[PDB]
Amino acid sequence: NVKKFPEGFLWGVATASYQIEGSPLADGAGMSIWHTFSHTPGNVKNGDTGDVACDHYNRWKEDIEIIEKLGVKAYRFSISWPRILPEGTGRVNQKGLDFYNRIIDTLLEKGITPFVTIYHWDLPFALQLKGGWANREIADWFAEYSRVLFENFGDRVKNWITLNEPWVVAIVGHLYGVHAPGMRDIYVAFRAVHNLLRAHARAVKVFRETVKDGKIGIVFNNGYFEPASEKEEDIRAVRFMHQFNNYPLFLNPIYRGDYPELVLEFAREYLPENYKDDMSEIQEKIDFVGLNYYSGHLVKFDPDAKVSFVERDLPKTAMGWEIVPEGIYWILKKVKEEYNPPEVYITENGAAFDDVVSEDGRVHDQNRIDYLKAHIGQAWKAIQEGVPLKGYFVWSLLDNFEWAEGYSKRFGIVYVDYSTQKRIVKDSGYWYSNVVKNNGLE
Numbered sequence: 241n242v243k244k245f246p247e248g249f250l251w252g253v254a255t256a257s258y259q260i261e262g263s264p265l266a267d268g269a270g271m272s273i274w275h276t277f278s279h280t281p282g283n284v285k286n287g288d289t290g291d292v293a294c295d296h297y298n299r300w301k302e303d304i305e306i307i308e309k310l311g312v313k314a315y316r317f318s319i320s321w322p323r324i325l326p327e328g329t330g331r332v333n334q335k336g337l338d339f340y341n342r343i344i345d346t347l348l349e350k351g352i353t354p355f356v357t358i359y360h361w362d363l364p365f366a367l368q369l370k371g372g373w374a375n376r377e378i379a380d381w382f383a384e385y386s387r388v389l390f391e392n393f394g395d396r397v398k399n400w401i402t403l404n405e406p407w408v409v410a411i412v413g414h415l416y417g418v419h420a421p422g423m424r425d426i427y428v429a430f431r432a433v434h435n436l437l438r439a440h441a442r443a444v445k446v447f448r449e450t451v452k453d454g455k456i457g458i459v460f461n462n463g464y465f466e467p468a469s470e471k472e473e474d475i476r477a478v479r480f481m482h483q484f485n486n487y488p489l490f491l492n493p494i495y496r497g498d499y500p501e502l503v504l505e506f507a508r509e510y511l512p513e514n515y516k517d518d519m520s521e522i523q524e525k526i527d528f529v530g531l532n533y534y535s536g537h538l539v540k541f542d543p544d545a546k547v548s549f550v551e552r553d554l555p556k557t558a559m560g561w562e563i564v565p566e567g568i569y570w571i572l573k574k575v576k577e578e579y580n581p582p583e584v585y586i587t588e589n590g591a592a593f594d595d596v597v598s599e600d601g602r603v604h605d606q607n608r609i610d611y612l613k614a615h616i617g618q619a620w621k622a623i624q625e626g627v628p629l630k631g632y633f634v635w636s637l638l639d640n641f642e643w644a645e646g647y648s649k650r651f652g653i654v655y656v657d658y659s660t661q662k663r664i665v666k667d668s669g670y671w672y673s674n675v676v677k678n679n680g681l682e
C-alpha cells in the first residue's frame with residue numbers, strides 16, 4: 241500500500257483567475273468574455289457570475305496562508321489578461337500587475353513554487369469584439385500580452401503555461417457554445433484551434449528571449465476513451481476521440497508538424513486553406529506537457545451524431561462524470577509512447593461532491609479523498625513504468641465558480657461558505673497535507 245514518489249516530485253493545487261478572484265472590474269481592469277457571458281441570461285446555472293466568486297482579489301494573502309499551512313509545495317494559478325491589459329494590447333494596468341506581484345512575492349517567501357497559466361479562458365472583451373480566437377491576429381496580441389507578463393514577473397516565476405485546455409477554449413466555446421464566447425460555428429472553432437497553436441508558439445518564442453532559467457509548457461484536457469464493443473467502427477470511434485479530444489490535436493502539430501490523421505479526415509474543410517504554412521512555427525520547442533484528467537468515457541460509432549458517449553453503470557461524481565482512476569495511468573503511458581515529452585505534470589485532477597458542513601463544523605469529504613487517492617496511486621504506477629511525471633496538482637484549492645455550472649459544483653480541498661466567504665479546510669485538505677509530507681501514500 242505504500243507508494244512513494246521520486247525525490248523532488250512537486251505536489252500542488254490549482255485555481256484559475258475568473259473562478260476565484262471576483263472584483264473583475266477592479267482598479268481599471270477591462271471586461272473579460274466570461275464577465276459578459278455569465279452576465280447573459282441563460283448561459284450559466286442559477287444566473288451565477290464570477291462578480292464575487294471567492295473574493296480572492298481581496299483574500300489572496302489568507303488563501304496563500306492556507307497553502308502554506310497545508311505544506312503544499314506548488315501553486316498553479318492564472319493571470320487575468322484584461323486586468324493587465326484592459327484593451328487586450330497597449331496600456332498596462334499597474335494595479336493589475338501589482339495584484340499578481342504580491343501573490344508571487346508571498347508564494348516565494350513561503351517556499352511555494354508558482355506555476356502561472358498565462359491564459360485560462362478570460363480573454364479581454366475588447367479582443368472578442370475584434371473576433372477573439374477567430375482572428376489570426378491574436379497570435380501577435382497574445383505575443384505582446386505574454387511579453388508583458390515575462391518582463392514583469394519572469395525574474396521570479398520560472399514555470400509557465402501558455403494555454404489551459406485549448407481544445408475546450410476552441411470547441412466548447414466556439415462549437416458547442418456552452419462556454420464563452422458562446423458561439424456555434426464549426427469553421428470558427430477550427431480557426432480557433434489553429435490560432436491557439438500559433439499563439440502558444442509565439443509566446444514560447446518570446447519566452448526564450450525574455451526569461452532566463454525558466455520552463456514553459458501547455459496544458460491539455462484528456463478523457464480515457466474506451467470502445468463500447470470490439471466492432472471495428474467502435475475501435476475507430478475511440479481513435480478519433482483520442483486524436484480530437486486529447487493531447488494529440490495539439491501535440492501532433494507541436495512535435496510532428498501537422499494535425500492527427502483522423503482529425504484531418506474530419507476537419508480539413510474547416511481549417512484555413514494554407515494552415516500547414518504555420519506548422520514550422522508551431523513546432524517551437526516546449527519544456528513540458530501538462531495533462532489534466534478527470535474521467536473515463538465509453539464511446540461508440542453513431543451515424544446520427546459520428547460518435548456518441550454511452551453512460552456506464554460506474555461510480556460518478558456530482559457532475560455525473562464516471563470515476564475511472566486507471567484512466568490517468570492510461571493517458572500518462574500513452575503520452576510518453578506517442579510523443580515522449582521530456583517532462584509531464586498532472587496539472588489538474590479532482591472531483592466535485594455534494595459536500596456537507598457537519599454539526600462539528602468540519603467538512604468530511606472522504607469521497608473526494610477516495611477519488612484523489614485512487615488517481616495518485618495510478619499516477620504512481622505510471623512513474624514506476626518510466627513516465628517522467630514531475631508533479632501533481634489537485635483541482636482545486638478552493639470551491640469556486642465552475643463556469644457554466646456556477647457555484648453549485650464544489651471542487652475545493654477547502655470549503656467556501658459563500659454567505660460569509662469563510663474558508664473551512666476539508667478532510668481532503670488534511671489528507672492531502674499528509675500526502676505532501678510523506679511524498680506519497682502510506
Ligand SMILES: CCCCCCCC/N=C1\OC[C@@H]2[C@H](O)[C@H](O)[C@@H](O)[C@H](O)N12
Nearest residue numbers: 256404405461532534535561635642643
Ligand atoms: C461527460 C463528458 C464531460 C466531461 C468533462 C470533463 C471535465 C472537465 N474538466 C474540468 O473540471 C473542473 C476543472 C475546471 O473547470 C478548470 O477550470 C478547467 O481547466 C478543467 O476543464 N476542469
